[PDB]
Amino acid sequence: DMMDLPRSRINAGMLAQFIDKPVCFVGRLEKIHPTGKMFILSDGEGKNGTIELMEPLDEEISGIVEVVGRVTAKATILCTSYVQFKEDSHPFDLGLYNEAVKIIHDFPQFYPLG
């Protein structure tokens, strides 16, 4: 039920500029709160974004995680949904994923922001 909205793909450094907006944030799982209700991700320039949940995680999470949610007034993300990337063949190059993000925000006219 923000599954029917456009969700900008962002890194940590653009959290402030996207307050209240629906977002999709990709990063590497750094740490999980003992409650399972928040955890930390790092993006491709080693910056952190804090992710929050209304209910505790169902399962172990690790490696690359793609989180969908709304950026909170405090530059946090309220998680609506996430997917763990698999890396069975080749490890995900997060650094280049971050280059790809920068490009989206420099050329919104070619990656129509919805």
């Binding site: 456009p6 793909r9 969908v68 994923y97 790809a100 490009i103 990656y111 129509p112």
Partner: protein, 128 residues
Amino acid sequence: RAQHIVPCTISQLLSATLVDEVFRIGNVEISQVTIVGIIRHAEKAPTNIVYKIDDMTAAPMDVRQWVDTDDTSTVVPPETYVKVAGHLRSFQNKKSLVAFKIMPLEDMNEFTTHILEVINAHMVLSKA
């Protein structure tokens, strides 16, 4: 006059206009497109399968696929990232894709790659 495949975001597909059965972005026409997104839902229809595929750029788009159940040459589960090659369609003002391949991504670096391919492909048309 044949045959070009433009990589696209779902929103780019939505922005395309339709005049006399011809879809256009700028002065350039398609037709054939690839997108990359996640399977949110999968219905078994009488004659084919309807996927809802979400790349984050809009609401999910409908994509029809055909399968032979006595073959593996079987529905892709939900939560899967998928590449899609198909033709753009519209019935009663509703955009959707008609798919010729739906290949699950084993290497998510193809997803990153696709974004860049989208961007460069549309930088190119833009200049035309």
